[PDB]
Amino acid sequence: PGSLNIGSLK
Amino acid sequence: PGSLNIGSLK
Amino acid sequence: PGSLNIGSLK
Amino acid sequence: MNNLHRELAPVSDAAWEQIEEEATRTLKRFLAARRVVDVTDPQGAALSAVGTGHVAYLDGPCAGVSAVKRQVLPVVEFRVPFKLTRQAIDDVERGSQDSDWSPLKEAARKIAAAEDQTIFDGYMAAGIAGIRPQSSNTPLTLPATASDYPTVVAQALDQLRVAGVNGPYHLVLGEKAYTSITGGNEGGYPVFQHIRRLIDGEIVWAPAIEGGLLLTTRGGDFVMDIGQDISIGYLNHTGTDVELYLQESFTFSALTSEATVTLLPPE
Amino acid sequence: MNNLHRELAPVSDAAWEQIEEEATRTLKRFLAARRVVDVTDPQGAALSAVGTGHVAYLDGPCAGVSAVKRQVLPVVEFRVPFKLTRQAIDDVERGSQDSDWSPLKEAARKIAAAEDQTIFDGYMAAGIAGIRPQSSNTPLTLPATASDYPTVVAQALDQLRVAGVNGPYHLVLGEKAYTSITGGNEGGYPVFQHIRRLIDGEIVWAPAIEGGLLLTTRGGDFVMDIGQDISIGYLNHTGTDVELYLQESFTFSALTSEATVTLLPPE
Amino acid sequence: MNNLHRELAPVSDAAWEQIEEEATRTLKRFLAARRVVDVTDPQGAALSAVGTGHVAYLDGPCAGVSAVKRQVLPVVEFRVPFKLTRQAIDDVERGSQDSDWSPLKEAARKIAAAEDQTIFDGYMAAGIAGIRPQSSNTPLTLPATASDYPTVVAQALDQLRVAGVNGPYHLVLGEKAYTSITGGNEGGYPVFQHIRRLIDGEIVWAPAIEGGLLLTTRGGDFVMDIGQDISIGYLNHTGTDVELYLQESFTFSALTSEATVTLLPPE
């Protein structure tokens, strides 16, 4: 909930 | 290897 | 055992 | 229900969707340091420290007994608050498509700048060391004119080649250096092409740092452990405003000290 | 092959079996504190810290950004060396059944005493706090004569009942108190029966501590996280001797501060 | 069990894996001469000499009997030792990812430099002749300025064309020449492109040689017979250190004497 998935921007 | 299992002595 | 395969680097 | 307490905020679903989209779009543009380091999957809010593998000697509890203590790297948490207007929040269901999200954009910019500064230059208060202060190579000063950058880039490449570090090379430059490169000659493209001609990588723009650096992206040199990613939470509200925040938790480690070359700003 | 390097030692399989049996038998008798606390399964040699769940305030990297740092408990490692004779080692295959393992017994006693002392009284050098120094109840002094112990036990039970702590109660006593109880009256059995008559638990003998204490074994009050259990390793050897060691790694936490009553030694 | 005696070393499997990975990565970067010559598969440790096919006259055992003796090329063995710290070795199982392998890197660099020097300039003590001393063309001196290299490259190409040698042409340059080319003009790329524009091959960087040369990679001109490839062995250990070594065995032959042009260093 509300994670705002970004992760790796490669 | 060589663990010498003791764990809980309850 | 321990060969460390390199061979040709072409 | 978790610590964010999102359901207690008087915000509609469409407004939430628009806010999330805007925040994601701003973060994807203002997050620079994430593209050059290894990033692990989120591990949860229970992550507190990461073991380094080293030990330190201790006096000893009893005679004939020796003791060592493990060394760890702690996790740090960042939070940035902001405020949104209830009229702009409510107009979304009426059909607005131009609501004001500038405080959210500013908060995202601030958190991205804080993360980039922590990664590149370290955070001494939390006990986290940066890449540039731990670099073991010889720093090089940037020239005054934009036409002399390629020779410094070549010197850095020569240093890396002599040290023996392979991989695709990326040049990270600050705002001042980027503007100096762009606003010269015929739009700066001949200098840009010279740099991209010496190095196979792309020039990365980093607004939160000064000077610049050159690094390699072969992998295995920089590790970022993320407990919780950037999220949105709710603090409180009044008759006309609602206060929210952005929050994240992470730790960082730089293993190889010879994989980067520091570029000092021009005198 | 692991860090113990057992295969490099000139020791036969039967000798290894006998040494392991003797060490296990000695440890099972001299390990006292393990019976009254919760013990987790081994987690491996990579365990370094355990998160407590609390945070500490920090100054802040940039304006408008706040920071907190997680708190952890470190893992500590203990090692105790000893020496064995090669003639006794070799006689096992010839058929000996009375080889000398006294240095191994002494090393096991020392490591058990160190673990018990660390658990009961804490290890300040490693940043680990004990149960008795963190107990919140009122300590009681033991009487001079062994015939006055039950009234002190009853007072401790009254304190626990007033505090509101349930569970089976166990009394842990030091060597001096145990000898004082045993060497009185008709062999000490009437006093022993009085104590076991007031408390439903059993009196536990702890050689490594002074005085005593009364606690409850309801569970959830004391946690021991073990990275690596007690193991045997090999250091070196000469023409007539072989040097080995015992090693372990763990950390400890006491959550409830009102579940124990401290018993000070008699004046 | 072979002559390396690896099992007698107190080294864990993970440490062995990391050491092998680091050694392979360093060797793959510092092995230059292997890319331009024909390399056979390993033949074993029993290889001692390679027949050339020529004979030499002898006096004669008896009247009416004539005798000749075959000619051979011997195999040479190289060994380079180094030392590693036991704390760094042991920290791998604890979870270290930044252990110090600099002595191993230095040993790999030394063995690579020795192999490259033996291949390019010969080893008179072992009776092995190099390529440059056996080249039959006219050597050319490198110019002082980096802007005059392409005309010398063109002269070498003209010499090769007049001699009648086809194939893709490769230019091997020393460290001094490589730095002179790179640190000139706009980062040295226009000179680099001029050289890669005259010759279809790539400029190869060789740290162990002076000056340079131009050769062809059509095949069948240079043969390297390898008995045993680069391997790791164990010598001994102490309480704090472990001594290892790198070892290899090979022989080399250059058949065609007109396929290379020698480039002497500038005056």
Are F260 and F131 in contact, with CB atoms under 8 Å apart? yes
**F30 close to D (CB below 8 A):** yes
Are B5 and E229 in contact, with CB atoms under 8 Å apart? yes
| E6–B1 C-beta distance less than 8 A | yes
| E39–B1 C-beta distance less than 8 A | no
Are F75 and F225 in contact, with CB atoms under 8 Å apart? yes
Resolution value (Å, 1 decimal): 2.2
Encoded amino acid at F38, one letter? D
Identify which of F82, F64, F97, F73 has the alpha carbon closest to the alpha carbon of residue F252.
Answer: F73
Encoded amino acid at F246, one letter? L
Q: Residue D253, by phi and psi: left (phi above 0), alpha (psi -120 to 50) or beta?
A: beta
Tokens 């490692």 — which residue?
Answer: E77
| DSSP element (H, E) containing E15 | helix E13-30
Residue to mutate among A3, A5, A6, with most D CBs inside 10 A, is A6
How many angstroms separate the CA atoms of F87 and F69, rounded?
57
**D44 close to E (CB below 8 A):** no
Identify which of D84, D86, D81, D79 has the alpha carbon closest to the alpha carbon of residue D101.
Answer: D84
Which chain D residues are within 8 Å of F30, Cβ to Cβ? 164
| C3–F6 C-beta distance less than 8 A | no
Tokens 């059944």 — which residue?
Answer: E97
Nearest to E79 among D46, D66, D75 (CB): D66
How many angstroms separate the CA atoms of F178 and F176, rounded?
5
Cα torsion D2, D8, D13, D16: sign: negative
Cα torsion F30, F36, F37, F38: sign: positive
Are E220 and E62 in contact, with CB atoms under 8 Å apart? no
Which chain D residues are within 8 Å of A2, Cβ to Cβ? 4, 6, 231-233
Are D67 and D60 in contact, with CB atoms under 8 Å apart? yes
Distance from CA of D229 to the nearest CA of A (A): 6
Distance from CA of B7 to the nearest CA of E (A): 7
How many angstroms separate the CA atoms of F74 and F126, rounded?
8
Please state whether at least 3 CB pairs lie below 8 Å between chains D and F.
yes
Residue to mutate among F8, F87, F93, F99, with most E CBs inside 10 A, is F93
Identify which of E173, E165, E152, E170 has the alpha carbon closest to the alpha carbon of residue E255.
Answer: E165
| D2–A3 C-beta distance less than 8 A | no
DSSP class per residue in chain F: --TT-GGGS---HHHHHHHHHHHHHHHHHH--GGGSSEEPPP--TT--EEEEEEEEEE--SSTT--EEEEEEEE-EEEEEEEEEEHHHHHHHHHT-S----HHHHHHHHHHHHHHHHHHHH-BGGGTB--SGGG--S--EEPPSSGGGHHHHHHHHHHHHHHHT--S-EEEEE-HHHHHHHHTSTTTTHHHHHHHHHHSSS-EEE-TT-SSEEEEE-SSSSEEEEEEEEEEEEEEEE-SSEEEEEEEEEEEEEE--SSSEEEEEPP-
How many angstroms separate the CA atoms of E80 and E266, rounded?
33
Distance from CA of B5 to the nearest CA of E (A): 7
Identify which of F239, F248, F237 has the alpha carbon closest to the alpha carbon of residue F83.
Answer: F237
How many angstroms separate the CA atoms of E120 and E137, rounded?
16
Nearest to D68 among E62, E69, E77 (CB): E77
List all residues of chain B from 1 to 10 with a beta carbon under 8 Å from chain E: 1-10
Three-class secondary structure of residue E204 per DSSP? strand
List all residues of chain E from 177 to 216 with a beta carbon under 8 Å from chain D: none
Query: What distance separates the 2 farthest-apart alpha carbons in chain C?
Result: 24
How many angstroms separate the CA atoms of F73 and F66, rounded?
24
Nearest to E61 among D62, D64, D118 (CB): D118
Tokens 């606690």 — which residue?
Answer: E215
Give the Å distances, CA to CA, from D51 to D69, D147, F97: 11, 46, 10
| DSSP element (H, E) containing E141 | strand E140-141
The three-state (H, E, C) secondary structure of chain D, written as one string = CCCCCHHHCCCCHHHHHHHHHHHHHHHHHHCCHHHCCEECCCCCCCCCEEEEEEEEEECCCCCCCEEEEEEEEECEEEEEEEEEEHHHHHHHHHCCCCCCCHHHHHHHHHHHHHHHHHHHHCEHHHCECCCHHHCCCCCEECCCCHHHHHHHHHHHHHHHHHHCCCCCEEEEECHHHHHHHHCCCCCCHHHHHHHHHHCCCCEEECCCCCCEEEEECCCCCEEEEEEEEEEEEEEEECCCEEEEEEEEEEEEEECCCCCEEEEECCC
Joined tokens for residue D187: 């739009």
Three-class secondary structure of residue E71 per DSSP? strand
List all residues of chain F from 205 to 264 with a beta carbon under 8 Å from chain E: 239
